[model samples]
Target: WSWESYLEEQKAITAPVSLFQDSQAVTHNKNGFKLGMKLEGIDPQHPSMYFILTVAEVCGYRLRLHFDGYSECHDFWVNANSPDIHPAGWFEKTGHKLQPPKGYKEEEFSWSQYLRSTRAQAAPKHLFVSQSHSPPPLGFQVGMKLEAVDRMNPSLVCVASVTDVVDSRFLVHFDNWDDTYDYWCDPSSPYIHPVGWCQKQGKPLTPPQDYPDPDNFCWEKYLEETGASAVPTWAFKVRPPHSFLVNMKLEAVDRRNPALIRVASVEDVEDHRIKIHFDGWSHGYDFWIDADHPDIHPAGWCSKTGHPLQPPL
Candidate 1:
């Protein structure tokens, strides 16, 4: 028996960390970037390589970068403080190779000549904020394999490799998938899991496209054939506590179209993750988010932060 109604005492317990009190809940920064400014950025398709990036558009703190020589469809958005971006002479300073555009000869391309011809200005080196979060611990190594979510197709957990490690980000290359599917994510990304996570969760693990022995696929054999070692499970951050309850209201980012933030509720809860149901949207759009993920926030988050929240469908 309770003051209002009979209920389980556990059900009445609130989250230990309130969204309003969590400093990491919202990160706002002003990065000075202008359209047409030229800079160096890591290519998502080739995370280890650097390419010339042109600021195609600037939306508040986000900058739409057009990879030089790549088509408009290849353009992508990044926040001003993204570590993937760098200054014009960054490659030389870091001793990394800079990839030339399609038409230019790799060795003959000159940034000065190109800048002179186009009358383009290079963004000031000081304005780039490369480190937004604390530097992650040093342990991840190139060629290490792990189970990871296909960011584009979030539902599928796939075999992926650590192709490159830049600051706090790892370039996850889905095994046997096209380079277009490769992406950079943090070590704390909830999407990535230990080698046997899919099996432990009773979820299907997506093998490489056209992989042999799908019915009797063996990770041990696959690792042997590929000569790659699984990344140590301890390298990843521990999962946050499961604090959310069913029907709890919060705001969420539309995973497919990340720019949209909408009202959502906890559809279901599991270890360290919760299924989110965007209000008024069909179940097809529901997705899982880790508890305390930055993409989710208190119901009034968008209004207080001046972000344009999308109304229910």
Candidate 2:
């Protein structure tokens, strides 16, 4: 007979191991009892069977029980007749088992120690005013000096002053936050604390208006006039007053004939002059409206069948 036929023939002769008996053997030791050991017990659903459980504590022979998060400490308890209570995972290949109740690792069982460690990692080493909380009632105006948290380095405090208030956040000026002069912080993070939080006090410093603009209006105009859609502008909308330096070429299309003339740069919008800078070339060339303009094809024009580029408010 094949291996599959032989296994099928022996299936009726084999008996399953009793989980309850196995559990009894694993827990019948003195050192087996610990403050935060996990155990398995007969599930109520299978009265004479076993299920994984954790031991919250050992009080004499009776044990404080923990049923995952399903029951409270007072809700669970153990006695002699509690059918097969064994250390959790006693039958598994892995010898160690999870502790009961909170199920925290043995090293992290102390509630106070765990909280202290967590707070140390999360609590801001320095303080800054958060927009979520109410600052001194004297509304922070433009040019107010303050010590703010450097978001990049929460532990380091930077001398910053209010530049502008957009939405509910403050635009602060900090050197270490970014190589550039413009760095912002939400009023909600504790990192933006007052100057008092710093070991060496710093006065509020003014930010110069020499911020480089990262927005490229010329490129935007080029894309719009060419009938190309789906350009992402949400970032520009949220953080305005920015500019991008771009080395771009232009292409002119006749609105009527729908032809293209690729050029280095736009010489004049009036003559339909489209000029574009070639890649790796220092200078650009100019081109005029022609029958080859890309707009001549239906694909070059804005869509007519689909929904408008911007839906109505």
Candidate 3:
């Protein structure tokens, strides 16, 4: 953990030292969701249904929402503050129907009875964010389509959907891809663009991984079939130059092992690009990456996303 130790171990290279500051990375929302808490959430597969959601796991700022009475395979990850989730009694307050778990009889199912029988805890009402606190409308809505950067493959832009909205941020779910490729971003994030941006920029738009005719893809026909509308071009902002500096720490994908994120430091910085060096790894392992690379995240990103983190080695 000491800089002197790192310096002594790598005497062949000049590694600069600087005081680490929290301001170097964007702050994430504080998480309050707890494991085993019951709440209500929209079933993504059945958007019209509100189902009982159990907080099966809690990460830094994320939660593994488990559909009650369903197997683990049905569990999905969401930010703890997702707008699609709500406290118990939400359905009654809003006069919306709450679907009972598959095996339960709708007429006999009740949160009171379920909680008492299962000895389960309900998520605190205070933890649910009030809609009044949500940002003024930027017109983002669920089901709106757009082109978004696949976080695992930043260079690829694919058709995506607005699956959920929270504050000024919205969840971007890649079409035909599992939830793993999904990410949340603001309308102005450089990683998202209007549907036809790649064509205009002369860059190839990567179709969904399971696209039937990858080479002959047509946005016009695709939208018509899906009944999805692309986000208006006016909603996007000009991509801005990156603001990064050497010696800053971040969570970065291990190029040699994409599934893991490692504590990384900026070895060098050039306009719109950066040289990433995994902390405690050899200098030869350093690689240059775009400043806007989606894999490079704020320092606590691995914890927030529940991704495995490889310690310095």
Best by lDDT: 1
Instruction: Give me the candidate number with maximum TM-score.
Output: 1
- Report, for every candidate in turn, its global Cα lDDT versus the true structure: 0.73, 0.35, 0.72
Model 3 Cα lDDT, one tens digit per residue, 189-308: 777888888889988888877888887888999889988888887777665566677776666777775546677788898766789999779999899987655456665556555556
Local accuracy of candidate 1 as per-residue lDDT tens digits, 261-284: 776778998876789988779999
The C-alpha local distance difference test score for the whole of candidate 1 amounts to 0.73
Q: What TM-score goes with each of the models? A: 0.65, 0.20, 0.55
lDDT of model 3, residue 92 = 72
Task: Write the number of the candidate with greater lDDT, choosing between 2 and 3.
Answer: 3
Q: Which is better, 1 or 3, measured by TM-score? A: 1
- Each model's total of backbone clashes: 0, 30, 0
Ranking by lDDT: 1, 3, 2
Q: Give the lowest summed-lDDT range of ten residues in model 1.
A: 1-10
**Candidates 2 and 3 compared by TM-score, better number:** 3
Listed per candidate, the RMSD to the true structure in angstroms reads 7.0, 31.0, 7.3
TM-score of 1: 0.65
For model 1, the stretches where C-alpha displacement exceeds 4 angstroms are 1-24, 42-51, 69-75, 91-102, 127-136, 147-159, 186-230, 250-306, 311-313
